[PDB]
């Protein structure tokens, strides 16, 4: 494990395997209803990290 | 693997285990220059599909 991905499971099985480095938008676009919710949350709880961090010190 | 969680690889060796039911800032901010790089761009790329996605329709 070099490269960062994130791990959906579609609907409640099989994981999902995402890099970051393309970030394939349908891919969450064909996940379930209850994903999108996660997903959704997952970037705004991280946006919130990053302004926490001092990176201008 | 049913929870979602992001994969950073602490520097170049070991990958990281963050949930995104809790999603630890300092794991985050004791990572290494380059990871917290991937990291913003990550969020902010995914943020972009979100937008892009029609829940409102």
């Not at 969450?28 to 919130?48: F, M, T, V, Y």
């Given at each position: 494990?070099?490269?960062?991905?994130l791990?959906?499971?579609?609907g409640?099985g099989?994981?999902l395997?995402?890099?970051?480095?393309d970030?394939?938008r349908?891919?969450?676009?064909?996940?379930?209803?209850?994903?999108?919710g996660?997903?959704?949350?997952?970037?705004?709880?991280?946006?919130?990290?990053?302004?926490?961090?001092?990176?201008?010190?």
């Amino acid at each position: 494990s070099k490269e960062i991905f994130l791990t959906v499971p579609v609907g409640g099985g099989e994981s999902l395997r995402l890099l970051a480095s393309d970030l394939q938008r349908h891919s969450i676009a064909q996940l379930d209803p209850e994903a999108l919710g996660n997903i959704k949350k997952l970037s705004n709880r991280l946006a919130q990290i990053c302004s926490s961090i001092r990176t201008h010190k």
